[PDB]
């Protein structure tokens, strides 16, 4: 986790800096091609976070999930963990979709 | 809803002074008048920040810490069947033949 | 699994209790059961310093894997064969427990039927 | 950031206004009063100030915004807040 | 309220548009609903029954409260923004330079020669500024906070020092 | 034991050295951030040696 | 300063209720003491219990961080209402509705967790089997006391 | 010192801002700020990738180098 | 500085940044495909899961109920 | 302008974490435990002229000292019942009645 | 102890015969030399204390208190010489004389073998302290503060005199070495209940105990800086020192007579910590922090365990240096803006960057960040109090949380945020002020290297 | 629209306040009077704030009044907490003391106190 989570923060810091301290994803958009390297790091970091097979996050998350659902365990806890795993892909999509895709929504002096 | 003419005139007058104050904040060429005064750089850094520190630490551990009981305690080495002991030359027997299930 | 739906929503009497398994004698319906065979000795596992949860009936494959890992250094990609032998032995050890669960389930069903057949 | 200049701010203020359909770009001057000379109402002036906030990426509070009634006054306001002296 | 009816309506309009922009996000979508919101204000623009107009404002404020964005967009340097007051720790008041050691002042001989011209200009202007505020203020003290301009060549607008010499918004 | 114990401690001692030259007046503030960055990069290398011994 | 300009006892008559308002720089209509219950407030004005965060940000306060003007009476609990502490600004959701929803969520979660503990999930697998009398000696058992044997059988 | 792009070039035609104008023109309304938004739908800012297209960035080159590798691998065995 | 800002226009991009971004996006995909070609079991399944409904009563030692 | 101070804090922020990780007794571990709390407080409130940053920094301390109640509880229990703070002696004695000390550690982790 | 008493007395002639402009230089230089020689008291043995004569003895409880006392004198002189600059020359020499005579009474108080000799010097410290507050205080209320200080003390001290004299009649001696061997148990009876109260209530008022503390915030708000330094650093610890000595002869009655005072302390420390959150006066805040810290010391002494006394000794020393440093820091602000209101001058880290470092360090010790001796003392008391009753961890834990809240509140309110626009006389910190703060913090942090020398006789 | 329901920690928005819209010359006059008081204080502060020869602190009578009022009355919840805490701790220690007498309290390795 210490790898892709740190990268994600540096990737957001790269965007925040380029957009004069703007941190709201609603005023971002249209950065997929304007910031090619930040985009690549922000997509690699997100796939690792969401457990894309064989990225750094897959070697712990997936081992942890299969051990949870094959354990003698509280059933409600097991269900909350799985729904949360799904949520990880959702807000991960929010960052990519609103920061990188679409048309630019930031001020005119680029 | 705009400025009264009295408000405009005050803004104009303050603005003249402000822009003059901001202009006066610039440094002249001579300021600040200071009072009179990759391999190599990385090699000295290693010498002063690794080699000297490890010289002092190794001296400290070898001739002070390790001369007192139980200051440095190691997990003893794992011994697997078939290994040989350096201290005594003893030979550990192998594990009996497996079912050879596969 | 379905086994949970059956126990919590259906008939808890003819579902094995995971905590109290097994409940029938080991030899009920098995003429001449053999004991499980342990390869590695207690001293060998003590010397190899295996974690206690790893000192099961598959420990000899683990000790074989651990020695190769140490000899193959720094080739950390070696020993893929030894690792698999250990994984597979632990897979067979797991299926055995599934069989024990199912045997307990079927015995609990037989006991139930033997009553209704007997109740009348 | 790139520094701002008095003429740089002026150009971007008139740029936004020229891209406003309710104004005639040929009649637009730095000193043209929005309500008197351009025939806009105060609902339009609200939108012009918002387009200026969006242009320069900062907010003009309502108390100040209501008083900016020509392009030159906006330029003076922006220049003051960002210490532009040029 | 010290605000007039016009001020309340225009403040609501600006605030309503900004919260609409937060909901819409996309520019084309915002442009569409920004026009529909303008049309609603234009429909009643000409209402003359001020009791009826005040009702329209009251109902529009309840509509805004119900439909506001719970997390509206805030400009980074605006109150509540992520950069608000971020640079205040770097703003040092100008009077701090009076306590500089002579060796520190000697590094900027030109800056401190100009600074003394300002401190001279300030001292010589103060009496006129005080007098002007005396002759212009009615008995009982001022009623508003508006300050007058200088009414004379060579005079400076009363109470200008801390306006003119205030720290830069990016002081370091 | 010598190399393992000795290199595991220089790692911790190496990181405190930039703090000493700061809080004790003896360094060149010209590019202190680069100096502090260099110490971390070198401390990573030293720490890797005991890691390899543990892995082996 | 002087005694007549400092706080005093609860203002009885309307004339003392007028010298207090003058002293505190308030309109005699706006000035109101705390109830005379002998709690020690004296004649200090009771001001609306609103946070400093609720004040106007864009006004030019004499103290911008506190959002205070020089000379204006200070709320009794002003050190509790600074912007670093207690906020009372209006909320987008009604206070009582928020309390219901947050309590409802937690109370639902704790209940469902208890349900989940009473009906645990597990796999259809028998107990793990360990050699040597369930590793009696390794687990710290007494080497003297031969344990009750544990025998596991092939299945 | 900075030269601004000529303002007459910004147009809503051929952009979603035009669809908005048609959608409003039904109700008797107009967007007077359309050209102020047009730059966002023109030039290098038009034709941004989809989410799937973003995730599949670099796949073309990655897949090729993958074929050249398993091809190389299965050749280093056929000899052996 | 050496990247001059632009007004209302797509920014200037260096060739170094474009190539590096593309090179590291291909390394990711190459890695995923190369790992999937060899370690598909880690994703799909290491071992076959037995069907307990097929085990005979003779395997599980279930004595006939008549007994 | 205080970038030199910033890197000094990042370095102290790291050192106190490495003291935490290698700590072999509960008291030495507590030094790192509280050390990261202070360094976190001084780095969250970096822009100290901003009221919100001062509030967030103090919030971090407040929530973290509520957890540290559990830390001290575990220290008090281990000294009383096992006569040690060293991890070696805690695990050798391996107490069966470990609900109270571990609830303390769980609250500290919370 | 003559090697410390005689040189201390010689400071009086030195000040009076010093050239007109050398009073602060001469007294400071030679009082520092006396502090240096005080380290020779560290000749402490494992079994026997250091017993010089029939009159004076020194153990590991009194030694750190003696060293703190003689260290504090030069620090008090540096802190006082600025606000006394306009004072009349002969009145300067009298102010220094009051401080020298306070040190004289204090070093003999901490080394007297017999309890009546301890009592007389324990009480003699009032006269100079009262004179300093009332003669050289600043406001009108210094006269009331002197009266509350005087009569709170005496209302407890006079019963103690009767109790001590009664003990000598029955036991035959009040020598502390003799009492260690002739101590007899105290049985239940109303006569013993009041003997216990008489022996303890004088020391409770000095700590001060919660309920009997309201004199302390008065004295601190009205004392000159040197008064506040000695009052907080040393004079409070007269009560703790006396308790650690006299509880020897109160067993086992302390087993149940301590309950009302442990409840006052355990609850009182939570109340006084919470009061600190709403104080408007910086000196009153620091005053109310002492009451909270000394509540731990009272509890530690009363439960009588080897760990609790070790923690009690470390707190008294650690608190002494920290509270004195905090008073000096606040005073340096006061010497500029001439007000003790905490909210008056804000954002001072912008204008006095190095003094904000001292503010940070003093606050970090005040909240007991490890491994400061502030935490070593606090932790030992919490460990022992847990074994006393496990529930105490709840009160102890809550107090630490609140202790951090007002410690950093004070730092944030005065040093951070935006500076006050109209305060324009904040001069750069003087070398005297910077050295004054460092001479507090540097010893305090140095003691973490060798904490045994402050843990007391039960180490 | 569900109506705002103010609370102690959640005041009523000004735009939702009926008193905010209904206005009578009395309220407008009352507002003017407050602006007069504020403007008089502002001028008094500005004449000292802007004075070139003033070096010091502009004493604020309002701040002096505030500190004086809140530092005036003192009474440091009476016996209830002390009696409550007494019973909690006494019962705990009596319970624990009994077990030690009977050997029923585990102190196998307890040798630090
Ligand atoms: C034998 C007897 C010998 C006598 C004793 C010798 C030691 C004393 C030497 C004093 C001379 C030092 C000197 O020359 O000044 C240089 C030094 C650096 O000069 P500077 O940066 O320009 O100072 C201006 C600001 O004050 C700079 O302020 P700053 O904020 O940048 O840094 C100052 C620093 C104050 O000093 C430090 O904290 C140093 C960092 C800690 C190491 O404050 C902090 O950094 C706060 C962080 C506190 C960290 C606590 C986290 C928990 C760690 C616990 C681990 C415990 C391990 C044991 O001066 C100081 O900073 C003042 C510090 C003096 C007190 C030392 C306190 C140590 C703790
Ligand atoms: C699993 C186990 C779970 C157990 C958890 C139970 C307790 C959970 C609740 C913790 C206490 C909640 C209080 C936290 C207050 C706080 O965080 O301070 C922030 C507050 C406002 O800050 P904020 O809202 O974030 O943003 C400001 C923007 N204007 O600003 C402030 O007002 C803070 C400054 C004033 C300080 C007030 C603190 C008073 C003491 C209350 C905290 C608890 C004290 C210790 C008692 C609890 C310990 C048992
Ligand atoms: C206050 C002054 C006004 C009120 C008068 C004071 C006395 C009333 C309080 C009762 C004191 C208890 C008492 O009277 O002690 C009597 C008892 C006599 O016993 P005795 O004759 O000696 O038996 C043979 C053993 N030799 O004595 C003894 O046995 C030993 C007693 C030791 C000396 C006790 C001194 C009296 C202490 C009373 C005050 C204690 C509380 C202090 C409160 C201070 C608050 C700040
Ligand atoms: C994947 C997610 C898994 C976790 C999901 C957790 C779900 C938790 C649901 C908690 C809901 C509790 O909130 C509940 O909502 C209703 C509706 O507002 C509240 O009721 C409120 O609204 C309605 C009126 O509009 C009325 O009931 C009542 O006037 C009012 O009090 C209840 O008082 C509250 O108890
Ligand atoms: C460990 C495995 C490593 C595998 C590495 C495989 C090699 C990686 C090669 C990266 C090529 C980088 O070079 C880059 O490639 C992409 C895709 O072709 C090109 O992008 C191409 O499509 C876009 C979109 O239409 C155009 O903007 C661009 O003009 C066009 O050339 C870039 O013009 C080129 O600069
Ligand atoms: C801050 C204030 C704190 C106040 C704390 C109050 C403590 C209360 C202690 C109660 C016990 C007092 O001491 C008590 O006195 C009497 C002596 O007459 C003793 O009892 C003796 O005399 C009484 C006479 O009435 C007889 O009933 C009894 O038969 C006899 O043994 C008790 O054995 C002893 O326990």
């Amino acid at each position: 986790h210490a790898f892709f989570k740190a990268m994600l923060f540096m990737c957001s810091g790269s965007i925040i800096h380029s957009l004069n301290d703007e941190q709201d994803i609603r005023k971002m958009g249209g950065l997929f091609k304007a910031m090619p390297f930040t985009t690549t790091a922000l997509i690699v970091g997100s796939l690792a976070l969401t457990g894309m097979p064989f990225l750094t996050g897959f070697y712990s998350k997936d081992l942890i999930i299969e051990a949870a659902n094959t354990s003698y365990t509280n059933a409600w806890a097991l269900l909350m963990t799985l729904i949360a795993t799904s949520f990880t892909a959702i807000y991960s999509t929010r960052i990519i979709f609103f920061a990188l895709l679409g048309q630019p929504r930031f001020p005119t002096l680029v | 809803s705009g400025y009264t003419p009295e408000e405009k005139l005050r803004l104009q007058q303050l603005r003249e002074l402000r822009r003059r104050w901001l202009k006066d904040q610039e440094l002249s060429p001579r300021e600040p008048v200071l009072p009179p005064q990759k391999t190599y750089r990385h090699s000295i850094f290693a010498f002063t920040h690794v080699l000297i520190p490890v010289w002092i630490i190794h001296y400290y551990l070898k001739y002070h810490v390790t001369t007192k009981p139980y200051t440095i305690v190691e997990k003893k080495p794992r011994i697997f069947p078939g290994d040989t002991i350096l201290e005594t030359g003893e030979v550990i027997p192998p594990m009996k033949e497996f079912p050879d299930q596969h | 699994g379905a086994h949970l739906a059956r126990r919590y929503l259906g008939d808890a009497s003819v579902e094995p209790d995971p905590l109290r398994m097994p409940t029938f004698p080991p030899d009920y319906g098995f003429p001449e059961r053999k004991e499980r065979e342990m390869v590695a000795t207690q001293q060998e596992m003590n010397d190899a310093q295996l974690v206690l949860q790893q000192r099961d009936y598959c420990a000899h494959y683990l000790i074989r894997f651990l020695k190769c890992k140490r000899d193959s250094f720094p080739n950390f990609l070696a020993c893929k064969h030894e690792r698999h032998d250990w994984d597979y032995c632990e897979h067979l050890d797991y299926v055995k427990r599934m069989k024990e669960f199912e045997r307990e389930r079927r015995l609990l069903q037989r006991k139930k039927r033997r009553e209704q057949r007997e109740a009348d | 950031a790139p520094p701002l200049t008095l003429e740089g701010i002026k150009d971007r203020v008139l740029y936004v206004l020229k891209l406003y359909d309710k104004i005639d770009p040929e009649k637009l001057s730095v000193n043209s009063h929005f309500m008197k000379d351009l025939g806009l109402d105060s609902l339009d002036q609200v939108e012009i100030i918002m387009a200026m906030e969006d242009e320069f990426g900062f907010e003009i509070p309502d108390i100040d915004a209501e008083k900016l009634m020509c392009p030159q006054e906006i330029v003076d306001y922006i220049a003051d807040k960002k210490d532009v002296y040029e | 309220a010290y605000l007039t009816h016009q001020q309340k309506v225009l403040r609501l309009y600006k605030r309503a548009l900004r919260h609409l922009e937060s909901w819409c996000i996309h520019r084309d979508k915002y442009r569409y609903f920004a026009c529909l919101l303008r049309a609603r204000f234009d429909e009643h623009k000409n209402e003359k029954d001020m009791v009826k107009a005040t009702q329209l404002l009251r109902e529009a404020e309840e509509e805004f409260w119900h439909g506001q964005h719970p997390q509206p967009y805030i400009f980074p340097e605006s109150p509540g923004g992520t950069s608000y007051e971020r640079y205040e720790c770097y703003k040092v008041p100008e009077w701090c330079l009076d306590d500089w050691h002579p060796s520190e002042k000697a590094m900027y001989p030109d800056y401190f020669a100009k600074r003394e011209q300002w401190k001279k200009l300030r001292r010589e202007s103060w009496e006129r500024e005080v007098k002007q505020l005396q002759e212009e203020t009615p008995v009982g003290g001022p009623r508003t906070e508006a300050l007058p301009p200088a009414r004379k060549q060579g005079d400076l607008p009363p109470l200008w020092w801390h306006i003119v010499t205030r720290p830069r918004e990016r002081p370091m | 034991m010598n190399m393992f114990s000795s290199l595991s401690l220089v790692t911790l001692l190496l990181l405190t050295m930039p703090i000493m030259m700061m809080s004790f007046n003896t360094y060149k503030p010209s590019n202190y951030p680069l100096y502090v960055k260099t110490a971390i990069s070198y401390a990573f290398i030293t720490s890797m040696i005991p890691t390899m011994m543990f892995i082996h | 300063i002087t005694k007549d300009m400092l706080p005093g006892p609860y203002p009885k008559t309307p004339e003392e209720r007028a010298a207090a308002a003058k002293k505190y720089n308030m309109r005699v209509e706006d000035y109101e003491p705390y109830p005379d219950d002998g709690t020690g407030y004296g004649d200090y004005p009771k001001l609306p219990d609103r946070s400093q965060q609720e004040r106007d940000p864009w006004y030019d306060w004499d103290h911008p961080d506190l959002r205070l003007n020089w000379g204006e009476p200070m709320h009794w609990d002003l050190d509790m209402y600074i912007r670093n502490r207690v906020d009372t600004s209006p909320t987008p959701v009604n206070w009582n509705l928020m309390c219901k929803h947050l309590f409802g969520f937690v109370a639902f979660m704790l209940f469902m967790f208890w349900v989940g503990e009473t009906y645990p999930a597990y796999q259809p697998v028998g107990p793990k089997q360990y050699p040597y009398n369930n590793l009696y000696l390794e687990r710290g058992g007494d080497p003297n006391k031969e344990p009750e044997p544990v025998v596991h059988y092939e299945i | 010192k900075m030269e601004l792009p000529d303002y007459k070039q910004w147009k809503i035609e051929g952009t979603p801002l035009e669809t908005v104008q048609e959608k409003l023109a039904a109700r008797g309304l107009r967007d007077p700020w359309g050209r102020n938004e047009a730059w966002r739908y023109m030039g290098g800012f038009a034709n941004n990738v989809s989410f799937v297209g973003a995730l599949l960035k670099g796949f073309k080159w990655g897949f090729a180098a993958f074929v050249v590798a398993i091809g190389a691998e299965y050749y280093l065995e056929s000899q052996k | 500085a050496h990247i001059e800002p632009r007004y209302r226009q797509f920014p200037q991009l260096t060739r170094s940044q474009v190539i590096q971004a593309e090179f590291f996006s291909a390394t990711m995909w190459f890695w995923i495909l190369w790992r999937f070609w060899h370690d598909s079991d880690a994703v799909l399944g290491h071992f076959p899961y037995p069907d307990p409904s097929q085990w005979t009563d003779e395997e599980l030692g279930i004595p006939p109920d008549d007994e | 302008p205080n970038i030199n101070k910033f890197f000094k804090y990042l370095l102290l922020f790291l050192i106190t974490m490495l003291i935490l990780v290698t700590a072999n007794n509960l008291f030495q571990l507590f030094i790192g435990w509280e050390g990261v709390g202070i360094m976190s407080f001084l780095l969250i409130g970096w822009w100290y002229g901003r009221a919100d940053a001062n509030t967030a920094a103090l919030q971090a301390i407040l929530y973290n000292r509520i957890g540290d109640i559990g830390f001290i509880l575990a220290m008090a229990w281990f000294l009383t019942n096992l006569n040690t703070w060293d991890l070696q002696q805690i695990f050798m004695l391996n107490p069966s009645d470990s609900n109270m000390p571990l609830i303390g550690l769980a609250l500290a982790a919370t | 102890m003559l090697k410390y008493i005689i040189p201390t007395i010689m400071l009086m002639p030195l000040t009076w015969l010093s050239k007109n402009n050398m009073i602060w230089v001469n007294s400071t230089a030679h009082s520092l030399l006396i502090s240096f020689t005080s380290l020779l008291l560290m000749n402490q043995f494992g079994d026997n204390s250091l017993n010089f004569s029939l009159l004076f003895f020194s153990d590991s409880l009194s030694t750190p208190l003696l060293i703190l006392t003689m260290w504090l004198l030069p620090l008090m002189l540096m802190a006082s010489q600025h606000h006394l600059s306009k004072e009349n020359l002969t009145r300067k020499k009298l102010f220094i004389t009051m401080l020298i005579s306070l040190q004289l009474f204090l070093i003999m108080t901490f080394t007297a073998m017999e309890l009546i000799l301890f009592y007389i010097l324990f009480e003699a410290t009032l006269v100079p302290t009262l004179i300093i507050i009332t003669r050289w205080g600043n406001q009108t209320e210094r006269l009331n503060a002197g009266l509350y200080f005087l009569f709170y003390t005496l209302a407890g001290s006079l019963p103690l005199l009767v109790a001590l004299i009664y003990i000598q009649n029955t036991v035959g001696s009040l020598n502390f070495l003799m009492l260690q061997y002739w101590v007899q148990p105290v049985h239940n009876s109303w006569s013993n209940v009041f003997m216990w109260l008489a022996c303890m209530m004088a020391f409770m008022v000095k700590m001060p105990l919660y309920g009997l503390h309201l004199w302390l915030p008065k004295a601190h708000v009205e004392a000159p800086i040197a008064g506040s330094m000695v009052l907080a650093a040393v004079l409070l610890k007269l009560g703790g020192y006396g308790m650690l000595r006299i509880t020897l002869i109160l067993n086992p009655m302390t087993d149940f007579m301590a309950y009302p005072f442990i409840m006052l302390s355990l609850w009182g420390m939570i109340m006084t910590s919470s009061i600190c959150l709403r104080q408007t006066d910086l000196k009153s805040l620091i005053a109310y922090s002492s009451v909270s810290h000394m509540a731990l010391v009272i509890v530690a002494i009363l439960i009588q365990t080897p760990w609790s006394y070790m923690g009690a000794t470390a707190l008294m020393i650690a608190h002494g240096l920290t509270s004195s440093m905090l008073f000096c820091l606040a005073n340096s602000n006061y010497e500029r803006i001439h007000s003790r209101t905490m909210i008056l001058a804000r954002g001072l880290q912008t204008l006095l960057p190095l003094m904000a470092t001292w503010w940070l360090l003093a606050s970090l010790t005040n909240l007991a960040l490890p491994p400061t001796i502030n935490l070593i003392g606090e932790l030992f008391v919490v460990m022992s109090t847990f074994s006393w009753s496990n529930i105490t961890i709840i009160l102890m834990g809550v107090n630490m949380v609140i202790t951090a809240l007002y410690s950093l509140y004070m730092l944030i309110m005065t040093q951070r945020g935006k500076y006050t626009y109209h305060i324009n006389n904040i001069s750069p910190s003087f070398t005297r002020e910077n050295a004054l703060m460092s001479l507090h913090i540097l010893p305090l942090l140095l003691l973490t290297l060798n904490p045994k020398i402050i843990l007391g006789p039960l180490y | 629209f569900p109506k705002y329901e103010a609370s102690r920690l959640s005041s009523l928005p000004t735009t939702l306040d009926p008193a905010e819209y209904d206005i009578s010359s009395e309220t407008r006059k009352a507002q003017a009077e407050r602006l007069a008081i504020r403007s008089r204080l502002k001028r008094e502060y500005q004449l000292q704030y802007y004075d070139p020869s003033r070096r010091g602190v502009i004493e604020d009578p309002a701040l002096v009044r505030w500190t004086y009022a809140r530092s005036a009355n003192i009474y440091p919840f009476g016996i209830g907490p002390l009696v409550f805490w007494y019973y909690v701790f006494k019962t705990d220690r009596d319970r624990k003391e009994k077990l030690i007498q009977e050997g029923k309290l585990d102190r196998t390795f307890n040798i630090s106190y």
Side-chain angles (χ1 to χ4, degrees), chain D:
Chain D
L4 296 174
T5 59
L6 296 176
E7 73 282 351
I9 297 157
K10 176 186 76 61
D11 292 330
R12 288 169 64 185
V13 172
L14 298 171
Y15 204 94
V16 175
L17 290 164
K18 277 184 270 176
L19 301 164
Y20 185 23
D21 280 0
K22 296 191 135 171
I23 285 167
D24 181 290
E26 275 85 329
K27 286 173 69 172
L28 177 68
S29 80
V30 300
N31 296 122
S32 61
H33 198 293
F34 294 143
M35 329 279 296
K36 264 201 287 292
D37 304 337
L38 299 177
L40 308 164
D41 65 323
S42 71
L43 283 169
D44 293 327
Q45 201 266 342
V46 169
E47 301 169 12
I48 289 159
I49 294 301
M50 293 177 70
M52 290 327 165
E53 290 175 5
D54 282 324
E55 172 70 14
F56 292 95
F58 79 100
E59 179 174 311
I60 299 151
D62 287 283
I63 189 74
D64 294 333
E66 54 180 64
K67 293 182 183 293
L68 309 173
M69 290 282 159
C70 73
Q72 180 55 70
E73 272 159 6
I74 299 164
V75 173
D76 288 332
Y77 187 94
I78 286 157
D80 183 15
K81 285 291 173 288
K82 313 197 172 284
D83 305 311
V84 179
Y85 67 89
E86 189 267 326

Side-chain angles (χ1 to χ4, degrees), chain B residues 45 49, chain F residues 11 14-18 33-46, chain J residues 11:
Chain B
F45 187 90
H49 283 69
Chain F
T11 303
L14 202 164
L15 303 170
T16 65
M17 276 169 102
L34 167 66
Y35 167 47
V36 160
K37 190 269 284 178
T38 312
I40 304 319
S41 72
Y42 271 74
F44 168 74
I45 299 307
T46 55
Chain J
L11 185 58

Side-chain angles (χ1 to χ4, degrees), chain K residues 149 152-153 200-220 231-232 235-240 243 261 264-266 268-269 272 286-299 316 319:
Chain K
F149 172 73
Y152 265 75
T153 299
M200 293 301 280
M201 289 300 294
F203 304 138
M204 287 300 180
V205 163
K206 292 300 224 74
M207 293 298 310
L209 173 80
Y210 177 66
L212 298 163
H213 65 290
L214 280 169
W215 68 266
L216 183 152
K218 261 182 160 286
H220 268 311
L231 187 63
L235 293 177
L236 294 202
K237 319 309 156 64
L238 282 164
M243 281 203 201
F261 303 101
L264 272 169
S265 305
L266 286 176
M269 82 187 167
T272 47
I286 298 153
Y288 265 105
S289 189
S290 300
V291 180
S292 190
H293 287 310
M294 290 297 105
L296 274 165
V297 177
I298 293 176
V299 174
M316 296 204 303
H319 168 266

Side-chain angles (χ1 to χ4, degrees), chain E residues 7 26 36 38 57 79 99 111 116 128 135 139 154 163:
Chain E
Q7 293 172 289
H26 309 288
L36 304 189
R38 175 61 183 276
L57 179 56
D99 307 302
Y111 180 88
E116 289 297 334
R128 303 196 292 282
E135 72 201 11
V139 308
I163 307 287

Side-chain angles (χ1 to χ4, degrees), chain J residues 15-38:
Chain J
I15 285 158
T16 55
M17 185 75 224
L18 289 197
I19 283 157
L20 203 162
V21 166
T22 66
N24 188 34
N25 67 72
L26 275 169
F27 183 85
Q28 190 166 338
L29 195 153
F30 193 51
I31 287 164
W33 195 261
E34 298 274 79
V36 297
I38 298 299

Side-chain angles (χ1 to χ4, degrees), chain K residues 210 214 259 263-264 267 278 280 288 305-307 341 387-389 391-392 395 421-425 427, chain L residues 45 49 54-58 63 66-67 70 74 76-77 81-82 85-86 89-90 92-93 96 112-113:
Chain K
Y210 177 66
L214 280 169
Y259 272 105
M263 298 301 102
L264 272 169
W267 186 245
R278 304 298 309 284
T280 78
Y288 265 105
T305 70
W307 270 71
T341 311
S387 193
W388 188 76
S389 173
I391 295 95
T392 62
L395 283 72
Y421 281 131
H422 65 83
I423 302 177
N424 61 4
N425 58 323
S427 309
Chain L
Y45 166 75
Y49 182 35
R54 184 199 61 78
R55 185 179 140 85
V57 180
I58 303 171
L63 184 55
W66 181 65
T67 62
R70 260 189 64 218
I74 62 170
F77 294 101
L82 301 172
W85 283 119
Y86 168 74
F89 287 119
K90 189 84 180 94
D92 200 60
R93 290 178 53 69
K96 165 170 77 84
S112 279
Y113 69 117

